[PDB]
Point group: C2
Chain length 148, copies 2
Amino acid sequence: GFKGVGTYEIVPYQAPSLNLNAWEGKLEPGAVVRTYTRGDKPSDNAKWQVALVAGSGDSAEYLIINVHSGYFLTATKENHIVSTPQISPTDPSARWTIKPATEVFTINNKVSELGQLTVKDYSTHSGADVLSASAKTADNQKWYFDAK
Amino acid sequence: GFKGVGTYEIVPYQAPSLNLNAWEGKLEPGAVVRTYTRGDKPSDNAKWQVALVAGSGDSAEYLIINVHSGYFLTATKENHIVSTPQISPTDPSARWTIKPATTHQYEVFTINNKVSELGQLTVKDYSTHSGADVLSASAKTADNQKWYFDAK
């Protein structure tokens, strides 16, 4: 469960055998983010520091920081893949709200036009693009937070 | 003023016309940090995002993230200049506690590394001149280890 700031695996609701992964786990900025096989213990490129940057409780905004690279999960365009570019912590496209979907959460960009984290094509297999796409109350837009 | 998380200029108590500045303001990792003139408006390399990563109130730990580069203020050595390298957010050397320098007030603070032995954010040699090195140095809560958080 999401209990505020901390380190987490972020796991797609339709495919809990997978997690959110910065592709190839390199220190170069700009990796795209996809679902990937979890393993028994997650790799640091598949662990994320949720870091509070504004507000609290209902008004909390967070950076979602890759543990390996230190880069921030960012939406660039609606219905396009998310990535971890080098970006200012004050850029709203790198800021997210984490809200109960109805346990299970949506991850919503501070720029409302950019939407929420969404697994492309409702995939349940490793290597699926994770998009920022407009909210549709769909199961591929729901996520678990597993504290690590 | 400090309210926990936020974007700030971090201003040394002895030299309030200066702030904490990532030297040269480039995007490459590894800038050292010095004091530098505030100016009429802050440059982005002299703005810092305080981001909560663990705990709360008394047990709060923060990243202090450069606004321009997104790299984290880090202590690398005892009594040595601080820097903004590329580093994991879970690395204790990049994590800080921000504590009132004296009780019964909420305006002057110490900035304390999570690695105890790395100490406090310190203006070298009590300098009041622009361009002074900012160190992680032995923690004494001296006046060169006290800081204000200014923010619009």
